[model samples]
Target: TVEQMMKSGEMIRSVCLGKTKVAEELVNGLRESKFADVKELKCYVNCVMEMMQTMKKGKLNYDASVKQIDTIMPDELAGPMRAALDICRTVADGIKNNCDAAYVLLQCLSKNNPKFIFP
Candidate 1:
């Protein structure tokens, strides 16, 4: 029926638009990823390592560092960087949710299959 075809077309259009938006965001995020040139990169690496050391010693102060990164100006965040962070946050949340689902599945499986066998 014409109605069915129209519905399908609408669904396709929605999917295509969503895909385009996702692609654009990904491209923007990739462009803003951490990077450095020679001296600058080396220093950045050193600082990161120092932070790691402090963390190991249970003396790491990440509040300032995190605040700085969180407050980065939009102008400083290339379109891609902003998109990447946005996408990354979404993905991380999704994974956390999925992990909880998996735990539930595992609990069900354990109860149903004490011998751990699947047919």
Candidate 2:
């Protein structure tokens, strides 16, 4: 169920990344890390946008692209990709945790509902 897990992870990540607060925090973190090159930052942002679109399209073939970057590039280009991956992972984890909590709460509520009680 790797695909299912990956999809769930992406959903969680999208929720986190789609937030203005998260975007602002990420920008602040990049700035604090001395990543001030506008051109490079724009490139990274574009890359992330592309990644988002890929995820939206349910494309699962980008692992090759990721691997190519990791295998062929110097740290300069790879760094931003690594950062993006880290953010994706973090957002996914947050989403999964939140979903788990929500599911539990919903289940508890469902238990008290007439439909569930009667059925």
Candidate 3:
């Protein structure tokens, strides 16, 4: 589940909020998350991925992420969403730092996926 992931996203976001010390006001901007300059925001993205168990050793666990996507994306949104994730997987390549990877990946999603939203 992607739905389960979404269901818990708010809870996860709450913890990331404090963990990254991202400004409260910026949380609104993060909803769409197509903007920013703070490393706090980048680290928040890493925190969310880490807490979700989607990152391993400071890098995204690609296999795990694809598995989850495959398991849940069978209805209608699955195809487009999974395809977008696939497209961004390559975008994540070459980024070594977890925070930078997370931020760049988010940027890829926002640019490539019409329905992209921050978690």
Candidate 4:
């Protein structure tokens, strides 16, 4: 399911950012049957890391990212897919040059409409 994938990806993102303990805690709650095998998880995380690393001059290339997502997924999935990447960009932008950026972004997202899927 897309929802489960999004949640798993976010947990993977924590590991990418050196939050191994956090990732472990998130994974521990799930039964073995609910998760992908190691190889699949590795590939998924690699794809995400590659996309994030493809930013243009220190910022997300929104158009390119959307195009890439559209190419890979059906139209129905694109909206939430785009929202997922947008949230990452939002979080990234918030953290740059601002210490309280994450907190502020979290508060703002909490108050916003249901377009975003925050994990």
Candidate 5:
């Protein structure tokens, strides 16, 4: 099972935050349903995804992420999360740069996920 890999999905956020060195203000915008884009912010997104095991080889691991959404999210939240992932998967397809890919996905998710927020 993939459970063990993402067994604890809590600490990775701050870990990536520290690693990416992005401005806290930029990321916190997610709480306000506002999104600001920057290279550092993009790299921060990728770092978090990498650490969370939701991304691999510069691409989002849809299978694992889907599992997480279905496994942990309630119906109200899960449906939107799945929809966002599906939509973003198309826009984010075949991306090479990890940061660029992560940023693109972030944009799509922000557009689609009604309750989108950063950790």
Candidate 6:
């Protein structure tokens, strides 16, 4: 339940972050494959890359990201929206000194909902 996941905030964030890291590894490999030219694949990669650049000092502009996510995510996800932002902040912190923040957010979405398939 959304409440359960939200209540276990820190744990949920950690699990989501870990899942994102693994997804990033898979995507990194895929980027070198024949799927490189696929338009949607490029869009996904670009979006994540742009998101990482939006973070600063291990954090994102919460207001802006939340607004965007709210506009894009389904209404059913509204309940756990705060949790998403919390997870985002965690991912931002995880990649503060690294260049892998993009994958963190990608992994986050998957962890938040297994149905969020990636290419």
Tell me the TM-score of each prediction against the true structure: 0.19, 0.23, 0.78, 0.35, 0.79, 0.42
Sorting all predicted structures by lDDT, with the top scorer first, yields 5, 3, 6, 4, 2, 1
Per-model C-alpha lDDT, please?
Answer: 0.31, 0.37, 0.71, 0.44, 0.73, 0.46
Runs in model 3 deviating more than 4 A are: 1-6, 70-77
Model 1: lDDT equals: 0.31
Better TM-score candidate (3, 6): 3
Judge candidate 1 at residue 51 and give its lDDT.
Answer: 29
Q: Compared with the true structure, what per-residue lDDT tens digits does model 5 show for residues 1-119?
A: 23432344346667777888889788777557565668778888888767656677787888998887677556666688788888888677788888888878877887889966445
| Candidate 4 RMSD to the correct structure | 9.5
RMSD of each: 20.8, 18.3, 2.6, 9.5, 4.0, 12.1
Model 4: residue 93 alpha-carbon error in angstroms:
3.5
Better of 1 and 5 by lDDT: 5
Among the numbered candidates, top lDDT falls to 5
Error of 2 at 108 (Å): 34
User: Candidate 2: where are CA atoms >4 Å away?
Assistant: 1-56, 60-62, 89-119
lDDT of 2 at 118: 6
- Global fold similarity of model 3 (TM-score): 0.78
Q: What ordering of candidates by TM-score runs from best to worst?
A: 5, 3, 6, 4, 2, 1
Residues forming the 10-long window of minimal summed lDDT in candidate 4 = 97-106
Off by over 4 Å in 6: 1-59, 78-82, 94-99, 114-119
Candidate 4 per-residue lDDT over residues 42-101, each given as its tens digit: 333333434444343334456786776566445566666666556655654634422133
Instruction: Give model 1's clash tally.
Output: 5
Candidate 1 Cα outliers beyond 4 Å, as residue runs: 1-67, 70-74, 94-119
**Clashing residue pairs in candidate 5 (N, C-alpha, C atoms within 3 angstroms):** none
Q: Write the per-residue lDDT of candidate 3 for residues 41-87, one digit (tens) a residue.
A: 88888887777556665666777776665563444545565677778
- Model 5, residue 92: distance off in Å is 1.5
